[PDB]
């Protein structure tokens, strides 16, 4: 596969890490060791601005990792945990489908391809709007978060 746990000393799950683009991120935030040898201990580089970190993917991974695209026209997207619309800048679930735990997970279009990773949510009623991590065309880290953004 191409995301990983990242575990507390319990063993515990905390949150995903994913192999895309021949580097490891995980969001910043997220407490542990990465549930794979050969990415446990490797150099990570803290961006406390995106709450990301992130490490060169080891050589025999670069065929595995997800490929990034930037086209996210407004429909619906895939996760773990079901349907993420994307609509007027947002992606949105519904409320009770994602929560801690679920931060590092990737949002995907239909071809497998990442288009944001999850951050938290903040809860509107019956939808949550997710806190993420997109890249734009030049290769430059976006962080949205709204309003009393919950990190999962």
């Given at each position: 596969d191409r995301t990983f746990a990242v575990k507390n000393e319990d063993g515990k799950i905390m949150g995903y890490a994913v192999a895309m683009e021949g580097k490891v991120i995980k969001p910043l935030?997220?407490?542990?060791?990465?549930?794979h040898p050969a990415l446990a201990k490797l150099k990570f580089t803290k961006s406390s601005s995106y709450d990301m970190e992130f490490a060169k993917l080891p050589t025999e991974m670069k065929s595995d990792a997800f490929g990034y695209t930037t086209?996210?026209?407004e429909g619906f997207y895939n996760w773990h945990h079901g349907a993420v619309q994307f609509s007027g800048g947002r992606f949105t679930i519904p409320?009770?489908?994602?929560?801690?735990?679920?931060?590092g997970r990737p949002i995907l279009d239909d071809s497998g391809k990442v288009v944001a990773i999850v951050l938290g949510g903040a809860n509107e009623g019956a939808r949550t709007a997710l806190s993420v991590v997109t890249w734009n065309k030049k290769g430059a880290a976006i962080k949205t978060t709204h309003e009393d953004t919950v990190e999962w």
């Open positions: 935030h997220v407490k542990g060791t990465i549930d086209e996210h026209p409320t009770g489908a994602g929560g801690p735990g679920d931060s």
